[PDB]
């Protein structure tokens, strides 16, 4: 695997979004990995609907929290529409898939990275964008405005983001908070510390879509 | 695993009371009621693109109200907003998501 991966530089990553005041990060996190595998497989970079997973994943609790795995599962079982077709409203409504005609695309399944394992995580990120969780509750996290984050943060993981690349001593994350946070919506978080939870719990819980 | 859920109920701090007191008037103006007593008793948080606070405030006699207050990301410097409230609530009613 390379020293550096940046999926943005390979055209696989769509602009930074803002989840607003809804706890829909799990929807957001999932969508970045969907957009990434489809570009990697098809040559096309599209935007897919977070608002559909929010309305439609019935193992998750809308704006009250939920799971990237079940959201990735929904897309492997049924499919997803385009974002332009089913736009983000920041509030859970009823699930409107059926009244938006056929799904724009679908994935084959979901896999889970082996947790607490940095190398495992990096290998998967060398293949495509991965859904990872961290602890974002802290003021330093929220206050982040650039550089390589070493903390402080604990490993009470509360927030699903997507790992879109790595270097020698960070892992590059796309966050859903707007571009006016951090490094234009991105944060580079320290790796290599020998801490097995990862920094901010980063190696706790990681899934990626399978699609050929 | 489960991302985006509020925290467990924590008992109010001074921060809790200040956040309530910021939003006191907005309540009072929406409810068409003046609350003489306005004491934060409990809280939950959830991390969004900002922070939702869910606050149980002792307002009354044995009478409570629950608050849903939005706090922005620091870099945004927007004032606290009362997104929603619940009325006629009890000491022992659980602070839940709404």
Interchain CB distance below 8 Å, A143 and B47: no
**CA nearest A166: which of A114, A116, A113, A130?**
A130
Contacts of A183 in chain B (CB under 8 A): none
Find residue A207's DSSP bridge partners. A112, A131
Asked about A159 being catalytic, the answer comes back as yes
Distance from CA of A43 to the nearest CA of B (A): 31
Length in residues, chain A: 212
Interchain CB distance below 8 Å, B3 and A133: yes
Find residue B68's DSSP bridge partners. B54, B84
**CA nearest B25: which of B17, B16, B34?**
B34
Is residue A157 within 8 angstroms of chain B, CB to CB?
yes
Measured distance between the N- and C-terminal CA atoms of chain A, rounded to whole angstroms: 20
Cα(A44)–Cα(A46) distance, integer angstroms: 6
Distance from CA of B82 to the nearest CA of A (A): 12
Using only C-alpha atoms, chain B has a radius of gyration, in whole angstroms, of 13
Find residue B47's DSSP bridge partners. B51
Domains and CATH numbers, chain A: 1-212 (3.90.70.10)
The answer to whether A131 touches A160, Cβ cutoff 8 Å, is: yes
User: For an interface test with A, which of B48, B53, B73 has the most A Cβ atoms less than 10 Å from its Cβ?
Assistant: B48
Is residue A20 within 8 angstroms of chain B, CB to CB?
yes
Annotation-wise, does A153 bind a ligand?
A: no
Cα(B17)–Cα(B13) distance, integer angstroms: 6
HEC string for chain A: CCCCEECCCCCCCCCCCECCCCECHHHHHHHHHHHHHHHHHHCCCCCECHHHHHHHCCCCCCCECECHHHHHHHHHHCCECECCCCCCCCCCCCCCHHHHCCCCECCCEEEECCCCCHHHHHHHHHHCCEEEEECCCCHHHHHCCCCEECCCCCCCCCEEEEEEEECCCEEEEECCECCCCCECCEEEEECCCCCCCCHHHCCCCCEEEECC
Q: Give the DSSP H/E element, type plus range, for residue B83.
A: strand B81-89
The answer to whether B40 touches B17, Cβ cutoff 8 Å, is: yes
A52 Cβ partners below 8 Å, 6+ apart? Answer: A80, A81, A86, A95, A96, A97
Domains and CATH numbers, chain B: 1-98 (3.10.450.10)
HSE of B87 in the Cβ direction (CA atoms, 13 Å)?
A: 7
Asked about A175 being catalytic, the answer comes back as yes
Find the residue in B nearest to A23 (Cα): B4
Experiment used for this model: X-ray
Distance from CA of B61 to the nearest CA of A (A): 31
> How many CB atoms within 10 Å of residue A65?
20
Q: Which of A56, A81, A153, A175 is catalytic?
A: A175
């Amino acid at each position: 695997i390379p020293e550096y991966v940046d999926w943005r530089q390979k055209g696989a990553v769509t602009p930074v979004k803002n989840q607003g005041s809804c706890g829909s990060c799990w929807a957001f996190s999932a969508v970045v990995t969907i957009e990434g595998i489809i570009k990697i497989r098809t040559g096309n970079l599209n935007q897919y609907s977070e608002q559909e997973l929010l309305d439609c994943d019935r193992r998750s609790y809308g704006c009250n929290g939920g799971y990237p795995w079940s959201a990735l599962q929904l897309v492997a079982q049924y499919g997803i529409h385009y974002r332009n077709t089913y736009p983000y409203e920041g509030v859970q409504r009823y699930c409107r898939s059926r009244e938006k005609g056929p799904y724009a695309a679908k994935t084959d399944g979901v896999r889970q990275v082996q947790p607490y394992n940095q190398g495992a995580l990096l290998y998967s990120i060398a293949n495509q964008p991965v859904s990872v969780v961290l602890q974002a509750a802290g003021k330093d996290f929220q206050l982040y405005r650039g550089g390589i984050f070493v903390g402080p943060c604990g490993n009470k993981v509360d927030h699903a983001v997507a790992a879109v690349g790595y270097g020698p001593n960070y892992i590059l994350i796309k966050n859903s908070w707007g571009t006016g946070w951090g490094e234009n919506g991105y944060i580079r978080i320290k790796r290599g510390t020998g801490n097995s939870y990862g920094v901010c719990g980063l190696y706790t819980s990681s899934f990626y879509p399978v699609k050929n | 695993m489960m991302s985006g859920a509020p925290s467990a109920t924590q008992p109010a701090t001074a921060e809790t009371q200040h956040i309530a007191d910021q939003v006191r008037s907005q309540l009072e103006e929406k409810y068409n009621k003046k609350f003489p007593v306005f004491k934060a008793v409990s809280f939950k948080s959830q991390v969004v693109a900002g922070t939702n606070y869910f606050i149980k405030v002792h307002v009354g006699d044995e009478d409570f109200v629950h608050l849903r207050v939005f706090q922005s990301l620091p870099h945004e410097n927007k004032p606290l907003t009362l997104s929603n409230y619940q009325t006629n609530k009890a000491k022992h009613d659980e602070l839940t998501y709404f």
